[model samples]
Target chain A: PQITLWKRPLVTIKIGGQLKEALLDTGADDTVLEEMNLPGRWKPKMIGGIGGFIKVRQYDQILIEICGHKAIGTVLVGPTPVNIIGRNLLTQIGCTLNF
Target chain B: PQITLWKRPLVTIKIGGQLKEALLDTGADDTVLEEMNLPGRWKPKMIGGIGGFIKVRQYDQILIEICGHKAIGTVLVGPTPVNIIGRNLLTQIGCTLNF
Candidate 1:
């Protein structure tokens, strides 16, 4: 599927057996999601961006389905304004930037 | 041009007759560049992200050439680790997310 940048590139993603909306953020290196309960042990970590840095719980080997494409990687759970599917998962789904 | 997610998606851009590298950031709403000198009057503004907010100078109708594709839009200059070519300019060049 080809998505135009006219609007926010929000796509439906399946995670933890639930459907959620997330942004395909090429700017981000790691996937970050709002705090949610997931089965598994996680480690405390920090991620930085345009603003600054924030503490997050790093959950490894988390499976996520982006627009029907399956991908698994380390997912960061923390307080974020939006759910971001970053390059870590985008690479798994063979996502690309095209013109 | 098509760019894979395996790399950082850094591209050469021409601005104010100087060539520099920038990231094609789909997650960012507006284009933000590192503190640079541009010939124009701008308004003080603030932008927010995963961490927090930062002050910036907004310059309107600035021209930029990305991978040889030309675009003109409002650009923000601030303290950013890397130059970001966001959706505001990506749309002008007909950029899209594809798989």
Candidate 2:
């Protein structure tokens, strides 16, 4: 099914076993979450895009579910106004921009 | 046609008879460009999002061309790091977010 990209493409997602809503952002190269707690080895990295750059904690091997599709990849936690699901995770679920 | 959104959806655009590249951003509420001169009456408005707010000149009845598709609507010109094509104009061309 096709959905219009009207307003912000916000979608419900499950991360770390918690339900959350995130924006389907095509402008972003990677996903950015405000803050989250996960038990795993991580490193500090900076992510930048339209707004600017911010320091984020990159956690690998995290389980994420959107629209019932699951994917395992890196998740970045930082000081962001809203949660964003970028192309990195979108690719796994066959998301695309269409007419 | 369906296109995979692997990375930032950067596409070529024609505005004010000038060619430019803009990111197809679903996260943005309105389309924003770096700076441009157009003959018409415009008002100043502050646009903000994850990066913060910036003053932009709002112009109406502007003709925009992207990927051979033409649309006439409002376009905001401001001091942005990158040119973004938001949902405002995307809706005119029937652009959508599909999975």
Q: What interface RMSD, in Å and to 1 decimal, does model 1 have?
A: 0.7
Q: Candidate 1: TM-score?
A: 0.97
TM-score, chain B, each candidate: 0.97, 0.94
Docking class of 2: medium
Candidate 2 residue lDDT tens string, B1-99: 456877678888999889999988888888899988987789998886655667899998889997778988889998888999899888988999888
- Colliding residue pairs in candidate 1: none
Question: What interface RMSD does every candidate have?
Answer: 0.7, 1.7
Ten residues in sequence with the least summed lDDT for candidate 2 chain B: B46-55
Candidate 2 Cα deviation (angstroms), residue A20:
0.4
**TM-score of model 2 (CA atoms):** 0.93
Show where candidate 1 strays beyond 4 Å. Answer: none
Model 2 / residue B62 / CA error / Å: 1.0
Report how far residue B32 has shifted in candidate 2, in Å: 0.6
- Candidate 2 lDDT at B66 equals 75
